[PDB]
Scaffold this active site. Sequence first.
Site, PDB file in Angstrom:
ATOM      1  CG  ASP A   1      22.238   5.247 -11.642  1.00 55.56           C
ATOM      2  OD1 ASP A   1      22.303   4.546 -12.436  1.00 55.56           O
ATOM      3  OD2 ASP A   1      22.654   6.544 -11.461  1.00 55.56           O
TER       4      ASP A   1
ATOM      5  CG  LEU B   1      19.588   6.886 -14.228  1.00 54.65           C
ATOM      6  CD1 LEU B   1      20.031   8.175 -13.841  1.00 54.65           C
ATOM      7  CD2 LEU B   1      18.496   6.912 -15.476  1.00 54.65           C
TER       8      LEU B   1
ATOM      9  CB  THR C   1      -0.952   0.020   1.210  1.00 52.78           C
ATOM     10  OG1 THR C   1      -1.840  -1.049   1.136  1.00 52.78           O
ATOM     11  CG2 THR C   1      -1.835   1.220   1.191  1.00 52.78           C
TER      12      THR C   1
ATOM     13  CG  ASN D   1      25.683   4.347 -10.515  1.00 56.28           C
ATOM     14  OD1 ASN D   1      25.026   3.433 -11.538  1.00 56.28           O
ATOM     15  ND2 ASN D   1      25.871   5.149 -10.363  1.00 56.28           N
TER      16      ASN D   1
ATOM     17  CG  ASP E   1      -3.493   0.066  -2.825  1.00 54.40           C
ATOM     18  OD1 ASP E   1      -4.377  -1.019  -3.265  1.00 54.40           O
ATOM     19  OD2 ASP E   1      -3.123  -0.060  -1.502  1.00 54.40           O
ATOM     20  CG  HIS E   2      -1.958  -3.603  -3.333  1.00 55.32           C
ATOM     21  ND1 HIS E   2      -2.639  -4.468  -2.915  1.00 55.32           N
ATOM     22  CD2 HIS E   2      -1.527  -2.861  -2.551  1.00 55.32           C
ATOM     23  CE1 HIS E   2      -2.917  -4.029  -1.626  1.00 55.32           C
ATOM     24  NE2 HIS E   2      -2.211  -2.929  -1.525  1.00 55.32           N
TER      25      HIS E   2
ATOM     26  CG  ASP F   1      -5.703  -4.283   1.969  1.00 59.66           C
ATOM     27  OD1 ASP F   1      -4.893  -4.943   1.290  1.00 59.66           O
ATOM     28  OD2 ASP F   1      -5.506  -4.420   3.332  1.00 59.66           O
TER      29      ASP F   1
ATOM     30  CG  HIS G   1      -4.904  -8.674   4.325  1.00 58.47           C
ATOM     31  ND1 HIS G   1      -3.507  -9.075   4.095  1.00 58.47           N
ATOM     32  CD2 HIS G   1      -4.821  -7.419   3.972  1.00 58.47           C
ATOM     33  CE1 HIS G   1      -2.959  -8.280   3.556  1.00 58.47           C
ATOM     34  NE2 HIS G   1      -3.473  -7.125   3.218  1.00 58.47           N
TER      35      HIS G   1
HETATM   36  C1  LIG Z   1      13.068   8.246 -11.655  1.00 58.47           C
HETATM   37  O1  LIG Z   1      12.824   9.856 -11.720  1.00 58.47           O
HETATM   38  C2  LIG Z   1      13.577  10.642 -10.919  1.00 58.47           C
HETATM   39  C3  LIG Z   1      13.125  11.972 -10.926  1.00 58.47           C
HETATM   40  O2  LIG Z   1      13.460  12.705 -11.964  1.00 58.47           O
HETATM   41  C4  LIG Z   1      15.037  10.562 -11.056  1.00 58.47           C
HETATM   42  O3  LIG Z   1      15.924  10.815  -9.925  1.00 58.47           O
HETATM   43  C5  LIG Z   1      16.545  11.943 -10.251  1.00 58.47           C
HETATM   44  O4  LIG Z   1      17.723  11.531 -10.767  1.00 58.47           O
HETATM   45  C6  LIG Z   1      18.792  12.634 -10.936  1.00 58.47           C
HETATM   46  C7  LIG Z   1      20.107  11.992 -11.415  1.00 58.47           C
HETATM   47  O5  LIG Z   1      20.636  10.994 -10.618  1.00 58.47           O
HETATM   48  C8  LIG Z   1      19.210  13.228  -9.589  1.00 58.47           C
HETATM   49  O6  LIG Z   1      19.859  14.459  -9.674  1.00 58.47           O
HETATM   50  C9  LIG Z   1      20.793  14.719  -8.700  1.00 58.47           C
HETATM   51  O7  LIG Z   1      20.278  15.459  -7.599  1.00 58.47           O
HETATM   52  C10 LIG Z   1      20.922  15.843  -6.484  1.00 58.47           C
HETATM   53  C11 LIG Z   1      20.546  16.825  -5.647  1.00 58.47           C
HETATM   54  O8  LIG Z   1      19.209  15.973  -5.051  1.00 58.47           O
HETATM   55  C12 LIG Z   1      18.446  16.468  -4.032  1.00 58.47           C
HETATM   56  O9  LIG Z   1      17.544  17.536  -4.649  1.00 58.47           O
HETATM   57  C13 LIG Z   1      16.397  17.091  -5.633  1.00 58.47           C
HETATM   58  C14 LIG Z   1      15.481  18.166  -6.207  1.00 58.47           C
HETATM   59  O10 LIG Z   1      14.716  18.551  -5.272  1.00 58.47           O
HETATM   60  C15 LIG Z   1      15.542  15.963  -4.704  1.00 58.47           C
HETATM   61  O11 LIG Z   1      14.456  15.418  -5.551  1.00 58.47           O
HETATM   62  C16 LIG Z   1      16.551  14.822  -3.967  1.00 58.47           C
HETATM   63  O12 LIG Z   1      15.735  13.878  -3.420  1.00 58.47           O
HETATM   64  C17 LIG Z   1      16.708  12.783  -3.225  1.00 58.47           C
HETATM   65  O13 LIG Z   1      17.163  12.659  -1.899  1.00 58.47           O
HETATM   66  C18 LIG Z   1      16.217  13.024  -0.637  1.00 58.47           C
HETATM   67  C19 LIG Z   1      17.127  12.917   0.424  1.00 58.47           C
HETATM   68  O14 LIG Z   1      18.078  11.812   0.458  1.00 58.47           O
HETATM   69  C20 LIG Z   1      15.078  11.808  -0.776  1.00 58.47           C
HETATM   70  O15 LIG Z   1      14.270  12.233   0.097  1.00 58.47           O
HETATM   71  C21 LIG Z   1      14.400  11.347  -2.098  1.00 58.47           C
HETATM   72  O16 LIG Z   1      13.854  10.393  -1.864  1.00 58.47           O
HETATM   73  C22 LIG Z   1      15.493  11.478  -3.188  1.00 58.47           C
HETATM   74  O17 LIG Z   1      16.202  10.253  -3.061  1.00 58.47           O
HETATM   75  C23 LIG Z   1      16.698   9.598  -4.234  1.00 58.47           C
HETATM   76  O18 LIG Z   1      17.601  10.134  -5.135  1.00 58.47           O
HETATM   77  C24 LIG Z   1      19.011  10.265  -4.632  1.00 58.47           C
HETATM   78  C25 LIG Z   1      19.974  11.173  -5.339  1.00 58.47           C
HETATM   79  O19 LIG Z   1      19.734  12.537  -5.638  1.00 58.47           O
HETATM   80  C26 LIG Z   1      19.361   9.094  -4.145  1.00 58.47           C
HETATM   81  O20 LIG Z   1      20.792   8.914  -3.574  1.00 58.47           O
HETATM   82  C27 LIG Z   1      18.399   8.116  -3.325  1.00 58.47           C
HETATM   83  O21 LIG Z   1      18.921   6.568  -3.278  1.00 58.47           O
HETATM   84  C28 LIG Z   1      17.083   8.019  -3.978  1.00 58.47           C
HETATM   85  O22 LIG Z   1      16.837   6.890  -5.011  1.00 58.47           O
HETATM   86  C29 LIG Z   1      17.907  15.523  -3.349  1.00 58.47           C
HETATM   87  O23 LIG Z   1      17.389  16.019  -2.118  1.00 58.47           O
HETATM   88  C30 LIG Z   1      22.419  16.580  -7.201  1.00 58.47           C
HETATM   89  O24 LIG Z   1      23.234  16.798  -6.130  1.00 58.47           O
HETATM   90  C31 LIG Z   1      23.204  15.707  -8.067  1.00 58.47           C
HETATM   91  O25 LIG Z   1      24.373  16.118  -8.799  1.00 58.47           O
HETATM   92  C32 LIG Z   1      25.500  15.359  -8.673  1.00 58.47           C
HETATM   93  O26 LIG Z   1      25.723  14.719  -9.984  1.00 58.47           O
HETATM   94  C33 LIG Z   1      26.166  15.725 -10.941  1.00 58.47           C
HETATM   95  C34 LIG Z   1      26.029  14.894 -12.429  1.00 58.47           C
HETATM   96  O27 LIG Z   1      25.226  15.980 -13.122  1.00 58.47           O
HETATM   97  C35 LIG Z   1      27.587  16.400 -10.464  1.00 58.47           C
HETATM   98  O28 LIG Z   1      27.716  17.118 -11.689  1.00 58.47           O
HETATM   99  C36 LIG Z   1      27.563  16.941  -9.537  1.00 58.47           C
HETATM  100  O29 LIG Z   1      28.894  17.341  -9.155  1.00 58.47           O
HETATM  101  C37 LIG Z   1      26.721  16.166  -8.359  1.00 58.47           C
HETATM  102  O30 LIG Z   1      27.759  15.221  -7.782  1.00 58.47           O
HETATM  103  C38 LIG Z   1      28.081  15.791  -6.658  1.00 58.47           C
HETATM  104  O31 LIG Z   1      27.708  14.860  -5.448  1.00 58.47           O
HETATM  105  C39 LIG Z   1      28.105  13.490  -5.433  1.00 58.47           C
HETATM  106  C40 LIG Z   1      27.317  12.651  -4.534  1.00 58.47           C
HETATM  107  O32 LIG Z   1      27.543  13.243  -3.215  1.00 58.47           O
HETATM  108  C41 LIG Z   1      29.608  13.263  -5.402  1.00 58.47           C
HETATM  109  O33 LIG Z   1      30.041  12.046  -5.581  1.00 58.47           O
HETATM  110  C42 LIG Z   1      30.380  14.308  -6.392  1.00 58.47           C
HETATM  111  O34 LIG Z   1      31.756  14.372  -6.260  1.00 58.47           O
HETATM  112  C43 LIG Z   1      29.900  15.543  -6.291  1.00 58.47           C
HETATM  113  O35 LIG Z   1      29.944  16.470  -5.045  1.00 58.47           O
HETATM  114  C44 LIG Z   1      22.266  15.319  -9.217  1.00 58.47           C
HETATM  115  O36 LIG Z   1      21.933  15.999 -10.101  1.00 58.47           O
HETATM  116  C45 LIG Z   1      17.698  13.808  -8.638  1.00 58.47           C
HETATM  117  O37 LIG Z   1      18.049  14.112  -7.321  1.00 58.47           O
HETATM  118  C46 LIG Z   1      16.760  12.554  -8.661  1.00 58.47           C
HETATM  119  N1  LIG Z   1      15.620  12.809  -8.166  1.00 58.47           N
HETATM  120  C47 LIG Z   1      14.747  11.906  -7.277  1.00 58.47           C
HETATM  121  C48 LIG Z   1      13.249  12.813  -6.788  1.00 58.47           C
HETATM  122  O38 LIG Z   1      15.062  11.023  -6.964  1.00 58.47           O
HETATM  123  C49 LIG Z   1      15.413   8.646 -11.386  1.00 58.47           C
HETATM  124  O39 LIG Z   1      17.032   8.858 -12.065  1.00 58.47           O
HETATM  125  C50 LIG Z   1      14.471   8.426 -12.363  1.00 58.47           C
HETATM  126  N2  LIG Z   1      14.593   6.765 -12.520  1.00 58.47           N
HETATM  127  C51 LIG Z   1      14.950   6.107 -13.556  1.00 58.47           C
HETATM  128  C52 LIG Z   1      15.195   4.794 -13.786  1.00 58.47           C
HETATM  129  O40 LIG Z   1      14.949   6.871 -14.626  1.00 58.47           O
HETATM  130  C1  Y2H Z   2      -5.128  -5.816   7.792  1.00 56.98           C
HETATM  131  N1  Y2H Z   2      -5.107  -4.244   7.587  1.00 56.98           N
HETATM  132  C2  Y2H Z   2      -3.798  -4.129   6.740  1.00 56.98           C
HETATM  133  C3  Y2H Z   2      -3.581  -2.879   6.327  1.00 56.98           C
HETATM  134  C4  Y2H Z   2      -3.374  -1.661   7.398  1.00 56.98           C
HETATM  135  N2  Y2H Z   2      -3.547  -0.339   6.963  1.00 56.98           N
HETATM  136  C5  Y2H Z   2      -2.475   0.326   6.191  1.00 56.98           C
HETATM  137  O1  Y2H Z   2      -1.482  -0.074   5.946  1.00 56.98           O
HETATM  138  C6  Y2H Z   2      -3.059   1.758   5.817  1.00 56.98           C
HETATM  139  C7  Y2H Z   2      -3.930   2.554   6.603  1.00 56.98           C
HETATM  140  C8  Y2H Z   2      -4.337   3.938   6.020  1.00 56.98           C
HETATM  141  C9  Y2H Z   2      -3.760   4.320   4.910  1.00 56.98           C
HETATM  142  N3  Y2H Z   2      -4.059   5.558   4.218  1.00 56.98           N
HETATM  143  C10 Y2H Z   2      -3.549   6.163   3.306  1.00 56.98           C
HETATM  144  N4  Y2H Z   2      -4.283   7.247   2.358  1.00 56.98           N
HETATM  145  C11 Y2H Z   2      -3.766   8.070   1.765  1.00 56.98           C
HETATM  146  C12 Y2H Z   2      -2.519   7.899   1.424  1.00 56.98           C
HETATM  147  C13 Y2H Z   2      -1.751   6.900   1.782  1.00 56.98           C
HETATM  148  N5  Y2H Z   2      -2.238   6.110   2.892  1.00 56.98           N
HETATM  149  N6  Y2H Z   2      -0.464   6.962   1.244  1.00 56.98           N
HETATM  150  C14 Y2H Z   2       0.782   6.217   1.691  1.00 56.98           C
HETATM  151  C15 Y2H Z   2      -0.577   8.096   0.355  1.00 56.98           C
HETATM  152  O2  Y2H Z   2       0.234   8.363  -0.268  1.00 56.98           O
HETATM  153  N7  Y2H Z   2      -1.863   8.672   0.388  1.00 56.98           N
HETATM  154  C16 Y2H Z   2      -2.210   9.842  -0.404  1.00 56.98           C
HETATM  155  C17 Y2H Z   2      -3.075   9.168  -1.684  1.00 56.98           C
HETATM  156  C18 Y2H Z   2      -4.503   9.014  -1.815  1.00 56.98           C
HETATM  157  C19 Y2H Z   2      -4.761   8.741  -2.821  1.00 56.98           C
HETATM  158  C20 Y2H Z   2      -4.164   8.248  -4.057  1.00 56.98           C
HETATM  159  C21 Y2H Z   2      -2.831   8.304  -4.040  1.00 56.98           C
HETATM  160  C22 Y2H Z   2      -2.159   8.951  -2.754  1.00 56.98           C
HETATM  161  C23 Y2H Z   2      -2.971   3.521   4.037  1.00 56.98           C
HETATM  162  C24 Y2H Z   2      -2.449   2.312   4.770  1.00 56.98           C
HETATM  163  C25 Y2H Z   2      -4.796  -1.941   8.267  1.00 56.98           C
HETATM  164  C26 Y2H Z   2      -4.535  -3.683   8.611  1.00 56.98           C
HETATM  165 CA    CA Z   3      -2.880  -1.560   0.059  1.00 56.12          CA
END
Ligand SMILES: *[C@@H]1O[C@H](CO)[C@@H](O[C@@H]2O[C@H](CO)[C@@H](O[C@@H]3O[C@H](CO[C@H]4O[C@H](CO)[C@@H](O)[C@H](O[C@H]5O[C@H](CO)[C@@H](O)[C@H](O)[C@@H]5O[C@H]5O[C@H](CO)[C@@H](O)[C@H](O)[C@@H]5O)[C@@H]4O)[C@@H](O)[C@H](O[C@H]4O[C@H](CO)[C@@H](O)[C@H](O)[C@@H]4O[C@H]4O[C@H](CO)[C@@H](O)[C@H](O)[C@@H]4O)[C@@H]3O)[C@H](O)[C@H]2NC(C)=O)[C@H](O)[C@H]1NC(C)=O
Ligand code: Y2H
Ligand code: CA
Length: 805
Positions: free
Chosen positions: A687, A689, A159, A685, A308-309, A261, A265
């Site tokens: 990723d 990509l 979910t 790595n 969702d599934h 769901d 279950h």
């Molecule tokens: C699916 O779609 C998504 C979305 O488009 C694709 O993911 C993107 O890929 C991009 C390329 O990898 C990536 O861009 C990087 O961003 C870095 C900044 O990141 C922050 O800001 C953004 C913008 O708001 C934000 O989205 C990020 O959010 C991530 O991290 C937070 C906190 O950890 C999480 O809450 C969140 O879930 C998300 O995590 C995911 O992504 C990260 C990587 O960003 C992973 O590590 C996680 O596992 C997770 O999957 C961030 O908060 C930016 O800093 C990067 O720049 C580096 O690389 C460039 C190359 O151009 C280089 O020139 C720079 O020097 C720099 O390198 C430096 O840092 C390195 C590491 O420390 C170091 O080795 C070097 O020496 C340098 O110092 C980069 O541009 C983008 O962030 C993500 N976005 C998201 C949302 O994931 C994804 O690829 C798609 N998938 C497929 C299969 O197509």
């Molecule tokens: C035996 N049982 C098995 C299952 C157990 N229950 C659970 O694990 C549970 C309870 C409540 C929620 N509720 C929930 N509502 C909106 C959500 C959301 N989760 N998330 C994650 C989102 O992103 N959105 C926003 C949204 C809304 C609509 C579409 C897309 C995203 C989920 C799961 C109870 C016992």
């Molecule tokens: Ca579910």
Amino acid sequence: WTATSGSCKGRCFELQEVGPPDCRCDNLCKSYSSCCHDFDELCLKTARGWECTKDRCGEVRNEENACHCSEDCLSRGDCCTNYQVVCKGESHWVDDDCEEIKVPECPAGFVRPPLIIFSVDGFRASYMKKGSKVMPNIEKLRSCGTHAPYMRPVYPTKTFPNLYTLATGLYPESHGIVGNSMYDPVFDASFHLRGREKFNHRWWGGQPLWITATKQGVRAGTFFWSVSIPHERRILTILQWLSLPDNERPSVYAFYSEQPDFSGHKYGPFGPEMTNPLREIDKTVGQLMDGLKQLRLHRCVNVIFVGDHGMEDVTCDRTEFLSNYLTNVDDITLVPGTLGRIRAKSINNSKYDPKTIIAALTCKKPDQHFKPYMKQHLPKRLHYANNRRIEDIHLLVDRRWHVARKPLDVYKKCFFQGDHGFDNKVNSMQTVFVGYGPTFKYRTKVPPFENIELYNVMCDLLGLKPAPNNGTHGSLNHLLRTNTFRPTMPDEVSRPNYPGIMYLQSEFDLGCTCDDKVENKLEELNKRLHTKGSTKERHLLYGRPAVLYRTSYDILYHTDFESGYSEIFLMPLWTSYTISKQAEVSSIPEHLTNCVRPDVRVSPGFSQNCLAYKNDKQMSYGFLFPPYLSSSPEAKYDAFLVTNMVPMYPAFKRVWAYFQRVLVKKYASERNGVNVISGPIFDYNYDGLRDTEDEIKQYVEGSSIPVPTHYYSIITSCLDFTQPADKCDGPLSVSSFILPHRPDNDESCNSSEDESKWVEELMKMHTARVRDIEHLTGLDFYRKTSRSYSEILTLKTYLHTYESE
Ligand SMILES: *[C@@H]1O[C@H](CO)[C@@H](O[C@@H]2O[C@H](CO)[C@@H](O[C@@H]3O[C@H](CO[C@H]4O[C@H](CO)[C@@H](O)[C@H](O[C@H]5O[C@H](CO)[C@@H](O)[C@H](O)[C@@H]5O[C@H]5O[C@H](CO)[C@@H](O)[C@H](O)[C@@H]5O)[C@@H]4O)[C@@H](O)[C@H](O[C@H]4O[C@H](CO)[C@@H](O)[C@H](O)[C@@H]4O[C@H]4O[C@H](CO)[C@@H](O)[C@H](O)[C@@H]4O)[C@@H]3O)[C@H](O)[C@H]2NC(C)=O)[C@H](O)[C@H]1NC(C)=O
Ligand SMILES: CN1CCC(NC(=O)c2ccc(Nc3ncc4c(n3)n(C)c(=O)n4Cc3ccccc3)cc2)CC1
Ligand SMILES: [Ca+2]
Ligand SMILES: Cn1c(=O)n(C)c2nc(Nc3ccc(Cl)cc3)ncc21
Ligand SMILES: [Ca+2]
Ligand SMILES: [Cl-]
Ligand SMILES: [K+]
Ligand code: NA
Ligand SMILES: [Zn+2]
């Protein structure tokens, strides 16, 4: 601390949440233990239930009632949903014929058709057909609107990952919600279904639709409802919000149902007890549509009905126990159930060893119902690796099964008959999509698609620019009457070179040999034409792929195949060839068994060498265009060019040779010709990509020849198989794979048998979308077809699943 002595008077289900210690009146206050003292009294009225009755019509407004049937209720926006039906002789929405909604018919003041997302937990795709008799409202949405036969969830099919993927367009590895339960080693914090850590915004990455809307000046209802708020109250609250003044009224709303769901279950997906939950969800849909009809919004709002599934039959007795495999079971932590994730119990235990854990879990029992993987070896189509919250060791569990650490976990923690979370290709895991409204098409069926695509479309429905996501924007244009998104193809970044003959044979010192020195003017002009591209239209059917990054590469033409040869990686990025239904398979002649030939178009410095392979005791080599499919004995020599060679472990050559010798011809006879594009992938790595050259972790010993992590193939033919692949007038059909390039076949438990017993099963597990291959290679395929670009985008997102019907 929350000072719960404030009041919800005039604040019931307020849209902006207030911060502690001020008390809350929003739809989530229950979940935070933070509602004002009078929230139940004011906001959760239940008196007299949810429906008008004949005797309540024109009643004097009593503010205590759950909903109202008094004359003023329409302008107050708080009638019971059946008010006009009971009291004003109107029909239920489900009883009206459907009539095409060619244009939004909205009240004055509406700037755009609102979007309502109606999400249902555990709603398995086959319920649309199997429960149709008991879901008349849902069936009317489905038949009158736009629907797919199913919608593919993301892995794991749980979910939290799926609802948040719906909201963000992102794979769980990118949005961070990678299961219902998680440990983040950087935070040193655990995320659980129960409790307060999950409320911390650091778990939730990407940008969900409600944030996208808000940032762009589109107001959103809140998407989360506290579990104890009844469905009837959620619907009533949405309908009230829809009666707010223009400046305050949201344009996007979500409803979520814990059913079916919850019951699935307990009773299994098709337990006789499941009929009632489906009737009840249908009644809820009917309440919403009748409520929209009262508000004159039923031909104005776009409604998305989405799950969702799905749900599978799973019982306590079908549980594998790790204690039956591992002696050191107390040294690990398992996230258990319909998937397994393993890590060390203690970071201080240096005795712990993942390599030996995986081996003790690999092919140990004849009908073993889970398979261990290092996360980077999981099928690329799952996109389940690039996150620190995903443990290195993963167990893919067979459908219908669970994994647990020890038997005591299962009886001291049979209750359940249903569960989900398995591989997102499994039929029982598929879920539903219906779109109904002015912006969706009328009575239209669309092929199955993945839930990662919906964010883009919901953004289109609301006129929002999507945040960067994993959908392919435009691939769902065929769902929509208007608001399509008309992308342009990406620009090529690197232009190819077209080398002619530039090197003499003796300039090459590659340690390669070939028995090819055996000497025509009727035929010399011919070989020259072939090397200049004369057969290219036959083998390159959809144009050459575009290279979307900066690199140096050559196009190489041959009688039987064309390639884009990388001077940087010393091998093709892609090799393209067409095999007609009539083609014959030949063998590699004896005298040519170890033949490798210098390519006089490509410098020795940009070529592989045979000596590196001789010296690398682990690594052997294969060919991208297979010599078995050469069109003539003379053309066969081209297949042994050093520019068609790629490094391959012997164990992988078993897989590759059977694909090339047997399967390609099989697909060509079945599909009436196929065009094949094959190549290497480097994703060290994990990723998803394309790696740059400085990311490559392994080379053929003593050389600069990089070792691929995967090999792909894209196999294209005519969707109308009465036409040959090379003379197709209409839509295409595709299947693709991304095979892990591994030095053993430990993944395949039957691999000591003949390749006919295990190879094809392996390749089906590693089925892929063309789009997955694009990400992994920086190539853009199907650049020159006669098809619309949106259609090609849909084709690129297609996944050939190999599941029954
Ligand atoms: C699916 O779609 C998504 C979305 O488009 C694709 O993911 C993107 O890929 C991009 C390329 O990898 C990536 O861009 C990087 O961003 C870095 C900044 O990141 C922050 O800001 C953004 C913008 O708001 C934000 O989205 C990020 O959010 C991530 O991290 C937070 C906190 O950890 C999480 O809450 C969140 O879930 C998300 O995590 C995911 O992504 C990260 C990587 O960003 C992973 O590590 C996680 O596992 C997770 O999957 C961030 O908060 C930016 O800093 C990067 O720049 C580096 O690389 C460039 C190359 O151009 C280089 O020139 C720079 O020097 C720099 O390198 C430096 O840092 C390195 C590491 O420390 C170091 O080795 C070097 O020496 C340098 O110092 C980069 O541009 C983008 O962030 C993500 N976005 C998201 C949302 O994931 C994804 O690829 C798609 N998938 C497929 C299969 O197509
Ligand atoms: C035996 N049982 C098995 C299952 C157990 N229950 C659970 O694990 C549970 C309870 C409540 C929620 N509720 C929930 N509502 C909106 C959500 C959301 N989760 N998330 C994650 C989102 O992103 N959105 C926003 C949204 C809304 C609509 C579409 C897309 C995203 C989920 C799961 C109870 C016992
Ligand atoms: Ca579910
Ligand atoms: C968009 N689309 C569709 O509706 N179908 C039914 C498709 N099938 C295929 N591939 C495909 C592959 C192997 C065989 Cl044997 C048969 C079909 N690609 C794309 C498809
Ligand atoms: Ca990579
Ligand atoms: Cl999980
Ligand atoms: K070797
Ligand atoms: Na094996
Ligand atoms: Zn569930």
